Structures are given as structure tokens and as C-alpha cells.
Amino acid sequence: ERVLCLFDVDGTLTPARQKIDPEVAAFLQKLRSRVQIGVVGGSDYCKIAEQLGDGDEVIEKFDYVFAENGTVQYKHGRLLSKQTIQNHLGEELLQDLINFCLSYMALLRLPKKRGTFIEFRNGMLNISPIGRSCTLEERIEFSELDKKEKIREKFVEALKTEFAGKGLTFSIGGMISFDVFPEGWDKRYCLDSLDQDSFDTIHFFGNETSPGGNDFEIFADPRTVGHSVVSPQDTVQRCREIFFP
Ligand SMILES: [Mg+2]
Ligand SMILES: [Mg+2]
């Protein structure tokens, strides 16, 4: 009787980094008459809020809003607290990681550098060799240089080796940055809080459920019924089959 559908945002519910089609959002609300619904995204809260309504309408349209993989949580309109990356990792390791990064980037010579090479978020560190504060034209410029030169990839190889065995995971999401977060702090992080909400079934939907994609772990977890989708339209049809047959 208590079921939750939980959705990746990008490519599952919305075109990536863009806004949800009204027909999609309309279906979701209809679906809500049979199940609770929720979203989990890698992005921070405001980015998700923007794709999924006006202002803070997102926390109203969805029963659960897990931003930054669930290190930041909204449940039934209310913001829950957040375990901090430094609390979990401790100051010594966090700073070891940070100092490794500053040192590596100091030796990097790029066409352009800007600011915010290291962004401190709730559940990860976003590392960006060009600097997060560049224009779109500068994103594209660096992005093309990165493919040629594999700047982020090399950086991530060096980081992985250096911190081997120490509990860190790395990404490479987008044109200019990569993420660093504690082992476990992928999308699965949200499931722990969900465990205390007594659902009989948690269905997960994603578009990156293949090995490597950021939906894989949450998709494969024994706490969720996994579904793999290719489009928001695919997602909608899938829910039609399962919940409106
Ligand atoms: Mg996606
Ligand atoms: Mg599963």
C-alpha cells in the first residue's frame, strides 16, 4: 500500500540541465494518486528546483527532494539536516585531498584560468582546473582542450592512486570539473533515510543504470526495484504500465 517512485532527474525526467515538459510534470502528479514520488539528483538544490517548477515549487510537487545525492534532503516540504563531508571524512584527510589538488593545479598551464578551482559543497568537492567562474564560451573552449589533452582524466588517475584505500570516489561530469566524495555518497546515500520511512516498495528510474553511469549503484541496490529508461517519455509510459494497467 505504501510505494515510492524515485527518479533520476536528467534524461529520466527532464532534458539534461533543462526544464521538465508540462505533460511529464502533469503525469507525475497523476501518478501521485497511487504512489509517493521523489527525485534524486547530483546537482545542488537550486539547480533541481529550477528544472522542476517555479521558485521552490519542487518541494511541493514532490514528496521527496534529494539533492547532491541525498546529502541534502527535503521531505514533505521541509528541509532535513545534512551530514557534512568534513564531519564524515575528518579534517586531516579532507585537507590532504585539498592540498593535493592545489598542488597539482599549480603545475597545470592552461589557456585561461579563472576562479573557484575548488568548490566546497555539502557532500563533495567539485574540482575544476579552469575554474568554475568562466563563461559559456570558456567552458566550451576548455572542454575541447580537455578531450585533446585529457586534463581531468590525468588528474583523476593521480588522485586515485594517491588516495588508494582511503575511501574516495571520483567522477568526470560535464565540460570542466570532476567530483570527489566519500565512498558510498553516490545516489545510494538517499536510501538510508528512506529505510526509516517504511515503504513496501521503492521503484528507481534512471537513464544511467549501466555499469559506470551514476544511476547504477542505486539501481542495483537490493532496496530498490530497478528500472532503466531512455527518455522522460519512456519513463512516463513505464509508469503507465506498472501503476495504470
Ligand atoms: Mg541522468
Ligand atoms: Mg535495486
UniProtKB/Swiss-Prot annotation:
One of its GO terms (cellular component) is neuronal cell body. IMP, a metabolite whose concentration is elevated in anoxia, inhibits phosphomannomutase and phosphoglucomutase activities and strongly enhances glucose-1,6-bisphosphatase activity. Strong expression in liver, heart, brain, and pancreas; lower expression in skeletal muscle. Disulfide bonds: none annotated. One of its GO terms (molecular function) is metal ion binding. It is an enzyme of class 5 (isomerase). Mg(2+) 2 binds at residues 219, 221, 224. Keywords: Acetylation, Cytoplasm, Isomerase, Magnesium, Metal-binding, Phosphoprotein. One of its GO terms (biological process) is protein N-linked glycosylation. This is Phosphomannomutase 1. It catalyses: alpha-D-mannose 1-phosphate = D-mannose 6-phosphate. Its cofactor is Mg(2+). CDD domains: HAD_PMM. Homodimer. Pfam families: PMM. Alpha-D-mannose 1-phosphate binds at residues 17, 121, 132, 139, 175, 177, 179. It is found in: Cytoplasm. The modification Phosphoserine is found at residue 231. The gene is PMM1. Signal peptide: none annotated. Its EC number is 5.4.2.8. Involved in the synthesis of the GDP-mannose and dolichol-phosphate-mannose required for a number of critical mannosyl transfer reactions. In addition, may be responsible for the degradation of glucose-1,6-bisphosphate in ischemic brain. NCBIfam families: HAD-SF-IIB.
